[PDB]
Amino acid sequence: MKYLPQQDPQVFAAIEQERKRQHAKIELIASENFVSRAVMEAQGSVLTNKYAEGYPGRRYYGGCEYVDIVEELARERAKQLFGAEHANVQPHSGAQANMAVYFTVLEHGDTVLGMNLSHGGHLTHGSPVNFSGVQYNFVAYGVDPETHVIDYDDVREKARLHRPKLIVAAASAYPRIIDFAKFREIADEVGAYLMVDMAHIAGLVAAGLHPNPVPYAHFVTTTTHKTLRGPRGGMILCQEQFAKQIDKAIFPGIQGGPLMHVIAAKAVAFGEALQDDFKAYAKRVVDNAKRLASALQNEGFTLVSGGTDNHLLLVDLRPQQLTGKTAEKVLDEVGITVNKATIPYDPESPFVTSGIRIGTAAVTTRGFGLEEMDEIAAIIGLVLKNVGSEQALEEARQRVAALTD
Amino acid sequence: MKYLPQQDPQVFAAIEQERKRQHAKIELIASENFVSRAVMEAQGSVLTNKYAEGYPGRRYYGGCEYVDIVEELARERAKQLFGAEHANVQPHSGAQANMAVYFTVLEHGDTVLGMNLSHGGHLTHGSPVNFSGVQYNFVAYGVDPETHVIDYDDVREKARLHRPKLIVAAASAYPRIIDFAKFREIADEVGAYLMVDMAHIAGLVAAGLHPNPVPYAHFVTTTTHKTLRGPRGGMILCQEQFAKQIDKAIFPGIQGGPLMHVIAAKAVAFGEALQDDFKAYAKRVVDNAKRLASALQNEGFTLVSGGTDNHLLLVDLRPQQLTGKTAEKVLDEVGITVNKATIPYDPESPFVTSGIRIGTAAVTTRGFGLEEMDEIAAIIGLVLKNVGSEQALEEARQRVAALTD
Numbered sequence: 001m002k003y004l005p006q007q008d009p010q011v012f013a014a015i016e017q018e019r020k021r022q023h024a025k026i027e028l029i030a031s032e033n034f035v036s037r038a039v040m041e042a043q044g045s046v047l048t049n050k051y052a053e054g055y056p057g058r059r060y061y062g063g064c065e066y067v068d069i070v071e072e073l074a075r076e077r078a079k080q081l082f083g084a085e086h087a088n089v090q091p092h093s094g095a096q097a098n099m100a101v102y103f104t105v106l107e108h109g110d111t112v113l114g115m116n117l118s119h120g121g122h123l124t125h126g127s128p129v130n131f132s133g134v135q136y137n138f139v140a141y142g143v144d145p146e147t148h149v150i151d152y153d154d155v156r157e158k159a160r161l162h163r164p165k166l167i168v169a170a171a172s173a174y175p176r177i178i179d180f181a182k183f184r185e186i187a188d189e190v191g192a193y194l195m196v197d198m199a200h201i202a203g204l205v206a207a208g209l210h211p212n213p214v215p216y217a218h219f220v221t222t223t224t225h226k227t228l229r230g231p232r233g234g235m236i237l238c239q240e241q242f243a244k245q246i247d248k249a250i251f252p253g254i255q256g257g258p259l260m261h262v263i264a265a266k267a268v269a270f271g272e273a274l275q276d277d278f279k280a281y282a283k284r285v286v287d288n289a290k291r292l293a294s295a296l297q298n299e300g301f302t303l304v305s306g307g308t309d310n311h312l313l314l315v316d317l318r319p320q321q322l323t324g325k326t327a328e329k330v331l332d333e334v335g336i337t338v339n340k341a342t343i344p345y346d347p348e349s350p351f352v353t354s355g356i357r358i359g360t361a362a363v364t365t366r367g368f369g370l371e372e373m374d375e376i377a378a379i380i381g382l383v384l385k386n387v388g389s390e391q392a393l394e395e396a397r398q399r400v401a402a403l404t405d
Numbered sequence: 406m407k408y409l410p411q412q413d414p415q416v417f418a419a420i421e422q423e424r425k426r427q428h429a430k431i432e433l434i435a436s437e438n439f440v441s442r443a444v445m446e447a448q449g450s451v452l453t454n455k456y457a458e459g460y461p462g463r464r465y466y467g468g469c470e471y472v473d474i475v476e477e478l479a480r481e482r483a484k485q486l487f488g489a490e491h492a493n494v495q496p497h498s499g500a501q502a503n504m505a506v507y508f509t510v511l512e513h514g515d516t517v518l519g520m521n522l523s524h525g526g527h528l529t530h531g532s533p534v535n536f537s538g539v540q541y542n543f544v545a546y547g548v549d550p551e552t553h554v555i556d557y558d559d560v561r562e563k564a565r566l567h568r569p570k571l572i573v574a575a576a577s578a579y580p581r582i583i584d585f586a587k588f589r590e591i592a593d594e595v596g597a598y599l600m601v602d603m604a605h606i607a608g609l610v611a612a613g614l615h616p617n618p619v620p621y622a623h624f625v626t627t628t629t630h631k632t633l634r635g636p637r638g639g640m641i642l643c644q645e646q647f648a649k650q651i652d653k654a655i656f657p658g659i660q661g662g663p664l665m666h667v668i669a670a671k672a673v674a675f676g677e678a679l680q681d682d683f684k685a686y687a688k689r690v691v692d693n694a695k696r697l698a699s700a701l702q703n704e705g706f707t708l709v710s711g712g713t714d715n716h717l718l719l720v721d722l723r724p725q726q727l728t729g730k731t732a733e734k735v736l737d738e739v740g741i742t743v744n745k746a747t748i749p750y751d752p753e754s755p756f757v758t759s760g761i762r763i764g765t766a767a768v769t770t771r772g773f774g775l776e777e778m779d780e781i782a783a784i785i786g787l788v789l790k791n792v793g794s795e796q797a798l799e800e801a802r803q804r805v806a807a808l809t810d
Contacts, residue, residue: 001450007443008673010478015669018471019451025468034454038412043666044449045406046424048630048637049439061744062737063430066423073415092497095661103536108513129657131508225453225662232453232664252534256500257630259637261448264420268413332467339466 026336026376026400030312030359031172031200033229034366035269042268043231047261055247067260074263077270081206084214084237089266090250090258091234094199094223098124099131100236100249101219105193106136106165113164113192115150116140118342118350120174122197139164143174143344148305150174152182159190169213170197173341173357175308180216195219201310203227203361206273207282210310218242227285227311227361229278230269233262281364285311288360291370295377301384304343304355312359316343320384324353330387331356334396335404336379372403431741431781431805435717435764436577436605438634439771440674447673448636452666460652472665479668482675486611489619489642494671495655495663496639499604499628503529504536505641505654506624510598511541511570518569518597520555521545523747523755525579527602544569548579548749553710555579557587564595574618575602578746578762580713585621600624606715608632608766611678612687615715623647632690632716632766634683635674638667686769690716693765696775700782706789709748709760717764721748725789729758735792736761739801740809741784777808 005012022034047067053060056068056075071089078087091097106112112132115121119142123130126138139162141155159167167190169183180196187194196213202222204210213220220237224230238246251258272278286309293307296315304314317327324340331338341357348354363372379396386392410417427439452472458465461473461480476494483492496502511517517537520526524547528535531543544567546560564572572595574588585601592599601618607627609615618625625642629635643651656663677683691714698712701720709719722732729745736743746762753759768777784801791797 001446003442004446004673007441008447008676011447011475011669011672011676014471014474014478015447015450015452017474018455021468021471022451022454027468029456029466031456032454034451036412037408040449040451040453041406041409042413042416042420043453044445045420046427046439046445047420048445048448049427049437050423051434051436061434061742062733063426063432063742066419066426069419069422070416073419092501093661095659096497096501099659108540123657123661127657129653131659134658135513232662232666248534252528252532253539254500254504254536256498256528257637261637264416267416268409271413271416328467337466337468 024335024404026403027362028336028338028358029362030339030357031226033226033361035229035231036272039231039265039268042265043261045261045264047264048259050260051257052260053251053257070260070264070267074267074270077267077274078235078237081270081273082212082214082220082237084220085240086238086243086246088236088246088250089263090255091236092255092259093232093234094221095124095234096254097221097223097234097236098197100246100254101195101221102132102136103253104242104245104249108135109137110166111137111139111162111164112166112168113139113141113155113158113162114168115171115174116142118346119143119344120171122172125168125197145345148344149176150178152179152186155183156186156189159186159192163190164192166193166195168195168197170199170201172200173312173314175305175310175313177210177309180211180213184216193218195221197221199223200226200312203229203273203282204286204310207279209282209286219246224266224269227282228269228273229361229365231262231265233259233266235266284369285361285364288364288368288370288373289313291373292358292360292377295374296380299377299381301381311361312357314341314343315356315358316354317356317384318354322384322387323348324355326387327356327384330383330393331380334379334383334393335400375399375403429740429809431808432767433741433743433763434767435744435762436631438631438766440634440636441677444636444670444673447670448666450666450669452669453664455665456662457665458656458662475665475669475672479672479675482672482679483640483642486675486678487617487619487625487642489625490645491643491648491651493641493651493655494668495660496641497660497664498637498639499626500529500639501659502626502628502639502641503602505651505659506600506626507537507541508658509647509650509654513540514542515571516542516544516567516569517571517573518544518546518560518563518567519573520576520579521547523751524548524749525576527577530573530602550750553749554581555583557584557591560588561591561594564591564597568595569597571598571600573600573602575604575606577605578717578719580710580715580718582615582714585616585618589621598623600626602626604628605631605717608634608678608687609691609715612684614687614691624651629671629674632687633674633678634766634770636667636670638664638671640671689774690766690769693769693773693775693778694718696778697763697765697782700779701785704782704786706786716766717762719746719748720761720763721759722761722789723759727789727792728753729760731792732761732789735788735798736785739784739788739798740805780804780808
């Protein structure tokens, strides 16, 4: 940076702290990643100055010729990446992408069937303190209490009983492959739309390491900042038959001016994802997650569903008589960042929990491999088996530092 | 830029076109401005990598110590700038800022009273194709058909008749000072909340050139990218008594992860606005708008309300037998960017219109003054009085080029 240090010493100092923090810690938040310098440059461009309500070639402001090129690059590369008939790259966030789809096909009070929030479902999949659960009548399907895999007979029974207008598949904390074919079959049975929220798994889908929801879903929503490794924002994919309706839902429905600089950054991230090396990266994410899972089991930890098919895993800490809150706190003390997480049929509140959620997307981006996964698991074991030993915690601290250089 | 040119030639070429476009054109879109290099650097920072759901010191993710500092700088500087008891700097946009306030105090189907959309009111103030008009029952107050000033007796009558739960004041195309005291008096009479959407005038308010709505309104919403000259986004100001409710409306109500890099950029923009030179700038914006108004009248143009008290003006093109659409198109041909705009009691559709909307915030930022205002008015006169003369249009083109260097 050149201008920020002089203009705003306070903001610059805080940003610099954050930058150094991102290098020093072992970042295991499943939803996080590190974007490229190109992506950041796009976000830091003069495109923030441009009002561009509407869509390419159909704007409500003149002078959009070039931001049109940018948005179209984003849309076309997204369509290449996922094989979708239509893309809307304007959603400000995952929240707004989901909001727009709901706005398109539902009226206030309509019944929607989503994943149980304590079993992996997201806040925007029906929380009663979120717009989703306040605006619409959400019911939930669950995972099997033993396997922790989605119970498709439960999905089917809930759908047949409650007759939702929309079924939502996908999750913020589900460590196994989702069967989109079965979701569509159930949706077809009850005459419901199917929406898939692939936010967490979007990069994996792009790399062919998770089945693609696009052929099975009427709508696919996603964020651009998780496994897709792009800027912070949302996107909607859909068949051509819903394109007009989806576009109208975003604008003039639920948003105004799009963030053209962020859309530029989306285009850049999609360009990166189209490359062979992104596919290799995504494989290492999944490989690393399996390795970390196995290594954690070797340390004596129980994992939700007994492992992982994707980028993320959940540790069930009940055998160690620890809460997720306690584990999160102590791992923070040694420089390892995780989330506390509710496990299926968790006896604890969502504010305490019996689990931690871990993902490998971020550490994989920084070049961590299988050996690093073994060491991360060993450090977690050292810490969680010795929460009362300051010497153990200091050793962990030193081993964390050794990993991050 | 260093990394974008190599990584993504296509995106870089389009951004470069846009940058050069921003220099070449006379940008008169009332809602636009040019942000500083510091603001852009903040947006282009690694803060995009950080999930920070929740609020400073009360996050749902660890490792937020430094992004907390950034958000708090934004909130505290906003409170300094506007004298508000509470700020929420998380809204992704003006749309979401407004959405959050509505979510806080209204239930589905509640009556809201806003400014007539063809008289200056915004899309999010009750359009039937926007969430506002679909989710809530909007009624409208109008301006006087002769003076084009808000008819406060009409505000009062509509409020007393329809008994709204919320009254919205403020506008996307109102060229005069709004009387917030009178709005609060009417709101008090009918037991309604008052929300002021100061998006357009926020920079002017910060510089003491427009009365501050904060003391009169229960909620004040704004964008950060118009006269405030910040990054693209939203903000809500309110009294302490609504702070918890407003914060909960943004999260977990209507959004997820905030854009921490954009929040950094907001902090920077607020820092700039706190400086003496921003106050001088804002005065020049208003001075330039008055000068441009007077110069346009000298050219024989009729202005909505007969002039301006702020950054923007509307030309009523009916005396010239031109539509706003025609004027917008031909001005585009010579390198002047305006919007077509509905005038009060416009005989034309909102897609054709009888007016153009012009603002001086952007040209003032690039250093234009009173002499430049005279020339801009003279060029507009030359063009709009000679729409069929290619030689006149080429002369205009050359005079536009002379202004932008």
